[PDB]
Amino acid sequence: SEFVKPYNNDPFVGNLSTPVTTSTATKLYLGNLPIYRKGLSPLLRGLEIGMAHGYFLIGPFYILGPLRNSPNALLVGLFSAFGLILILTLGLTIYGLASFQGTEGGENLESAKGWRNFTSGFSIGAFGGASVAYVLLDNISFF
Amino acid sequence: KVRVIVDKDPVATSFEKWAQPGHFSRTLAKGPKTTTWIWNLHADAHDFDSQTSSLEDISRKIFSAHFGQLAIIFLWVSQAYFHGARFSNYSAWLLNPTSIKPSAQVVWPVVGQEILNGDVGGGFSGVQITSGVFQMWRASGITNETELYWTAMGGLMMSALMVFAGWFHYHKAAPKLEWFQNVESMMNHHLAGLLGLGCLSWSGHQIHISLPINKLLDAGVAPQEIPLPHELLFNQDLMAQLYPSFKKGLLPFFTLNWGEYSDFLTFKGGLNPITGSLWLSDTAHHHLALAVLFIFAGHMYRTNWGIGHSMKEILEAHKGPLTGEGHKGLYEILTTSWHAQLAINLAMMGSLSIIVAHHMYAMPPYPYIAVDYPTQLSLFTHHMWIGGFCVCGAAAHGAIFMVRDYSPVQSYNNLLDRVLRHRDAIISHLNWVCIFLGTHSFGLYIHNDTMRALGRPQDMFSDKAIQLQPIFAKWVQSLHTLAPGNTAPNSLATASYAFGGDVVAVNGKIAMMPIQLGTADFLVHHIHAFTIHVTVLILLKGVLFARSSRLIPDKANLGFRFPCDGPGRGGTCQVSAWDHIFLGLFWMYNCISVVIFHFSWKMQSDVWGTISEKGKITHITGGNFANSALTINGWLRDFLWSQASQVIQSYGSALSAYGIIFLGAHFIWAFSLMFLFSGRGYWQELIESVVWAHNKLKLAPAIQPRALSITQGRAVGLAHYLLGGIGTTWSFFLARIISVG
Amino acid sequence: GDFLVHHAIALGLHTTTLILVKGALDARGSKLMPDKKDFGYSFPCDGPGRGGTCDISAWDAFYLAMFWMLNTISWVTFYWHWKHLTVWGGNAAAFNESSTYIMGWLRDYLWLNSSPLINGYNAFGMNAQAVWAWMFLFGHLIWATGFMFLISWRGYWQELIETLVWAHERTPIANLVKWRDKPVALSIVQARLVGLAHFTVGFIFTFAPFVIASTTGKF
Amino acid sequence: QAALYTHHQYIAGFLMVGAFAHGAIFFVRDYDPEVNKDNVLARMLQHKEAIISHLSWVSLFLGFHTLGLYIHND
Amino acid sequence: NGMVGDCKPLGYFDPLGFSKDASPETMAKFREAELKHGRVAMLACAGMITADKFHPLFGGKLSSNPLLAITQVPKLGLLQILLFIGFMEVFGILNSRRPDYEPGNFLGTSQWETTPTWDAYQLRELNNGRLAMFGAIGMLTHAYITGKGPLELLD
Amino acid sequence: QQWVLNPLKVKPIAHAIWDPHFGQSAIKAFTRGGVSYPVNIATSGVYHWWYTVGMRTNEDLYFGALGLLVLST
Ligand code: CLA
Ligand code: CLA
Ligand code: KC2
Ligand SMILES: CC1=C(C#C/C(C)=C/C=C/C(C)=C/C=C/C=C(C)/C=C/C=C(C)/C=C/[C@@]23O[C@]2(C)C[C@@H](O)CC3(C)C)C(C)(C)C[C@H](O)C1
Ligand SMILES: CC1=C(/C=C/C(C)=C/C=C/C(C)=C/C=C/C=C(C)/C=C/C=C(C)/C=C/C2=C(C)CCCC2(C)C)C(C)(C)CCC1
Ligand SMILES: CC1=C(/C=C/C(C)=C/C=C/C(C)=C/C=C/C=C(C)/C=C/C=C(C)/C=C/C2=C(C)CCCC2(C)C)C(C)(C)CCC1
């Protein structure tokens, strides 16, 4: 048998159609991720990605941060998450400015308006996710 | 059939081609026109496949070169034995091993060097040795100097025989390629005939000469009163007196009542309390079992008779969905190309040297070698360095095979083709692994330094601030500690006391001790993994991208080692697989240097030392590894600065030679940087100015001087760098360990 | 000791002048490259032809002589610092005795006076010289990182960047984020410059710490 | 005192290297042999081979002998 | 027909003829259920075998009894296991919804040139799944009866 | 001003340290020079230079800084 064939029946493209690259599991999961999901607007793509990253970003600061052994450990973790998210959304905005200089199409991540909607979604979502993880970690004794 | 087929008188014996210097190569045979000719004569000396196209001739040259090398090695074994016979204190050490410093070299009084004949005990003045040959001979049972003298003479006879064999097998009766390509019979004879019979013979030697002599020495009999080996060999009554099972003869062997030999064939394990080393009965049983295993293994491959395997068929039968044709063509590759075989063999030899280094220190095999702290450190470090060098040689010869002997007609859609077809994925993923591993492993050290300097020990990656415990290593150590009862019931002790158990100590000094693993061990082990991974990255990229790359599609046409392909494409510098090896040698050097530093500090702080009558364990450095190895500042202070005292304060003492070599190796390491950083163009222009100065005086040579080639400059820089660094570590370790231990 | 170290200083000055004067005089042309002025001041090379033409541009003469400038100034400053530490401490018969051999410099100047620096912070605590210890190690690290750019040259890193470009372009999710400038390995003169930069900054950081902390800890 | 001496000696070395580098840039960029026909500056290029060879000689002598005496003492 | 579940000891084993006069949809549902049961039972049997004598997690002293261990596990761990399994099952449902869909192939084997070797290894998967299906039920039943784990029951 | 009274004993201060990464131990260690905050001990000789030149109070140094700022402007 042969589970490694040319990518899209093109032997001269620099890729291989391995199980990892071209399996139905990989295709399903990637195509269903928000950045690839069909029908999602750029705002919702950014929103889902933002909440996703903001929920987990608080944790390293909370437990491994300098004030882990302090009564305000989770507060400092949330503030650190907000700062890191501010840096990340600044990076997103400058990336959009540098890449999609001249664009008018919109409704597309590869355009200025679409990337701006995506960045707004990411920023709000990540702030909300950091706050939500703060709220859950305050009341973790519930579970 | 497998048969002997050789050509007679293939090459005449004459000094005419000794006189003709560059005869071996077509270009060099013309004669010199520049000084680069002189260097190329040495560079292409042993490149037989560039000299002659015939694989038969290449094989014959290689075979006789192997003979010459064995002659050199026999002369080296002879030097060891003869120096022990004559210019040594082996008898004094044999009488009193713990206090006597082993020494088998003496300097002559000429220019004040006579101080180097330091006080080594036993009424003998000489240079202390650290090779462990004294302990080797004690294990072998040598108790007199006549034995050392006569085995040295035998070694000289064998060296002469090997020179004769090398001459004969190239000038009088050279084999054919058909003879050389009998890989199946070669494997059969090397397994059963070389390894198997070697182990069987050594087991017999041990059982007959080493067990009785060593047991009597441990009992207390002085070497003078020990019965001689020839008496012991046939005196069955004495051997029955020592080991009662010998009175039963060989009938318990021929009948399968092998349990009768339990006394002198044991599975005791651990270390002998007297000598603080492995039990020689255990070693005899070990070698006997290995002899049986190798003789059993050597009857696998096909020969003149119908039974046996074909490695071609075995390889061709292994092909999977993700591998296409699988191992098809590899048998032909390894039968046709010597460089592929050299690559594999060098890789395994180097890994074996490293495994030897790891095994000997944890399980001291020779008597009174564990207490001989210089010997353990020297052997471990030496074998580590040899292993790294062999691994890089493996990578280099793999690249050479790729450049020269690779062919798609042969290796189409096999594992080699499939590996080349995703080399980019391989190297990119190894690059990510290297970045991740180095970032974590070194940034933990850097974090520790930062927090210590900021006065925040509570934020450290220490054993008491943020613990990174090697839970898996601790679990494996616990399993090995509990092994002798549950999973190895016939074993009476653990394989090595490093995992756990009692503190073996001979006299006051400590032979072996359990080695604890904590946060520092976690950090340094991940550092080791990072260094190994970067070395593998460099070497594997060199091997894979020897044919071509996205930068140079025709890299194979240029050759294996070439300077560049010009300043185009932004610069194509060191694109060659040779230059990849040149860079990987720096990285294995760094890897082995960190490994030996870890070994030295850990053994000095946690294992080596002394134990008093009550049990006051006092280590050489005082257990500072666990709390100081967490920072690079601690590595710089408590290991290099702290232990350099015994080197730098060595002037006016017997270790002053180590001090001089410390400085000289430093000098050579720095001298290497000239070649490593500089370039041929400047040097050729400087030589032009000097050549004008000479031509003004009518003495510019006919062989015009030239700056060294680019590849040669890189090679010279690498050689000087390695020599300087290795000599620095050599002098430092030897001076420190001889002074303190 | 002053005799010998002064002759060493003469060696340093003369060799730095040799490299620099040769670069200046051969910048226009040489027997290996008579038309160097056409290429200019700083170019990578002339190619592997004619035996190789590495570091031929007379900018590389400057880059080579920078190592010797650092070497000779280091010798000068070691001489100054050791003689003055001995004079200030009142034992000039340490310099007068030990400076005649090189192990005296390696032991009674570097090793002896490195203790208060490297003991800036240890397992038991920290002192006010911990910043000097950290900067000492910092300069060591930069000096070491310079060797990378000085030894390893562009072809290896270019091919490695081809591999990384392949990986970034082929992985999902991340390949939506795409560069504008094609990432390439550093040019030859650029990497010579970077390696020399890491060397020099390193030099100055290491000696600054060692010269400012050992003096403070010894007086 | 030590900080100031080290500082100013290092900057002196840098300034000297820069002076020579800009002399090289002048030679390769701004030097006009037609203007400097048989000049005091052109004669420097004329016997540059002698200059470089003798600087090589003195550097070699100094290094050989200083290193040798230091090793003798060592 | 068209599947790879047949074997030597029983041939094409269908005594009650469920597949007889059945649609390809029902056949695909049956094979998906078969492979899911086999895989889950492999995981179960391996989990009991390993955790009986080597259970370092959760303080290293949770009960070796399979039935008691899951009750001893914290609620959050059970919730996370359920979330993980559900996240695999949504992709199972999507693979079922796909136009090309073999029953248990998350790998998408149809796009590659497969052979009798692939068929034989699918048969290996299925046979091991059947054996593990019997094994897991046996282990749980013995755990309920005796209260010992698999290897302790063997002890 | 304190250094002027006792030049040979008081260690000159370069500037205050502002670092949130400092621990309590580093804070206590770097608190030196007869001040209540962490500081860096000057090794540039500017104190000696200005004292020799004629500066005796912080006001003179501040006015020098102001005038140099105007010069740069
Ligand atoms: C100390 C000296 C030094 C350093 C730092 C490096 C660094 C590196 N070498 Mg090596 N190298 C060296 C000497 C050194 N080399 C020398 C002398 C040579 C010549 C023989 C080479 C030759 C060489 C080759 C040929 C290759 C490497 C590779 C690498 C990389 C390994 C991946 C890694 O762990 O990166 C991680 C980075 C580090 C370990 C440095 C410290 C990182 C910590 C976390 C600090 C982080 C700081 C912060 C985030 C940023 C700055 C803060 C602020 C100022 C903004 C990396 C770039 C290999 C590679 O490409 O790997 C993929 C490779 O192929 N090196
Ligand atoms: C519940 C799991 C399950 C399922 C869904 C299937 C499904 C299938 N098997 Mg079967 N099979 C199973 C378990 C299962 N198998 C086990 C454990 C064995 C080992 C004995 C086999 C052995 C086996 C063979 C050898 C073959 C098949 C084949 C088939 C396929 C065609 C026959 C058919 O219509 O079966 C439909 C099956 C069902 C509708 C399941 C009904 C289950 C009843 C209700 C339970 C009976 C068990 C009883 C209550 C308890 C047993 C004792 C103990 C555990 C308590 C079909 C995909 C054939 C095939 O693939 O041909 C190409 C084939 O050759 N199977
Ligand atoms: C199905 C498989 C599975 C997956 C793929 C998976 C993935 C991840 C990831 C993402 C990669 C994170 C980030 C994460 C984190 C944590 N997992 Mg978790 N996990 C799985 C299974 C279990 C089980 C069975 C348990 C468990 C736990 C914890 C705790 C501890 C909390 C605590 O200290 O109380 C934390 C923080 C234990 C628990 O909740 O204990 C009350 C517990 O029993 N997980 N887990
Ligand atoms: C149904 C189905 C499938 C399925 C399935 C099944 C059955 C999946 C089962 C998965 C399973 C069972 C996965 C458990 C993981 C547990 C982990 C990682 C534990 C972490 C544990 C952690 C992080 C910590 C533990 C601690 O104790 C430590 C060490 C110290 C103590 O102080 C306390 C804490 C808590 C801190 C397929 C086959 C997949 C596909 C098919 O199509 C459909
Ligand atoms: C695949 C896989 C994996 C992975 C996984 C992962 C990666 C996971 C993750 C997970 C996660 C990561 C999760 C998450 C969650 C989240 C959440 C829970 C969130 C929430 C949010 C919110 C609630 C928000 C809100 C808001 C606000 C508040 C404000 C306004 C705005 C908004 C509305 C947004 C593993 C390897 C393991 C295994 C195998 C498979
Ligand atoms: C008074 C006195 C004296 C005297 C002195 C003298 C006389 C001195 C001199 C000195 C000198 C005499 C010095 C010099 C120096 C020099 C230098 C340092 C140089 C440099 C150079 C350069 C760098 C160059 C460059 C260039 C080029 C290359 C080209 C062209 C251009 C130019 C020029 C730019 C005495 C001591 C006796 C005593 C006391 C007093």
Side-chain angles (χ1 to χ4, degrees), chain A residues 1-5 17-20 22-30 32 140 142-143, chain E residues 75-76 87 91-92 94-95 98 100 102 105-109 111-115 117-118:
Chain A
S1 177
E2 177 53 285
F3 282 73
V4 182
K5 65 182 209 296
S17 186
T18 54
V20 171
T22 317
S23 40
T24 305
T26 279
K27 263 175 276 172
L28 279 165
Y29 172 55
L30 291 173
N32 266 297
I140 195 61
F142 166 81
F143 313 94
Chain E
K75 296 144 66 155
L76 266 177
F87 198 61
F91 293 125
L94 294 154
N95 179 33
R98 263 181 150 261
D100 69 51
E102 321 86 339
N105 277 260
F106 291 85
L107 209 74
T109 174
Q111 61 227 55
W112 288 292
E113 293 278 351
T114 49
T115 88
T117 61
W118 167 250

Side-chain angles (χ1 to χ4, degrees), chain B residues 427-428 430-444 446 530 534-535 537-538 541 574 580 582-587 590 721, chain C residues 138 140-153 156-157 160 164:
Chain B
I427 295 300
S428 89
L430 193 48
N431 188 302
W432 165 76
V433 169
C434 289
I435 295 170
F436 153 79
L437 203 49
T439 37
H440 281 62
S441 58
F442 188 58
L444 268 39
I446 293 300
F530 155 66
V534 174
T535 313
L537 169 52
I538 294 145
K541 200 181 89 73
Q574 290 181 9
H580 286 65
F582 153 85
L583 291 170
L585 271 149
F586 289 98
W587 258 97
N590 184 237
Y721 193 100
Chain C
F138 190 57
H140 266 88
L141 181 66
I142 300 153
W143 188 81
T145 320
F147 278 45
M148 178 171 14
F149 298 89
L150 298 160
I151 294 158
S152 74
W153 292 358
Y156 178 94
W157 303 100
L160 204 67
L164 296 169

Side-chain angles (χ1 to χ4, degrees), chain E residues 1 3-7 10-14 17-20 27 29-34 37 126-127 129-131 133-134 137:
Chain E
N1 204 21
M3 302 164 172
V4 74
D6 60 343
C7 49
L10 310 171
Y12 171 55
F13 183 72
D14 194 348
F18 290 96
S19 68
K20 201 182 70 52
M27 271 165 238
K29 167 156 121 170
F30 297 152
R31 175 50 61 83
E32 178 67 327
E34 175 170 65
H37 293 113
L126 274 157
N127 281 326
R130 301 160 214 287
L131 173 54
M133 272 194 243
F134 279 110
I137 303 300

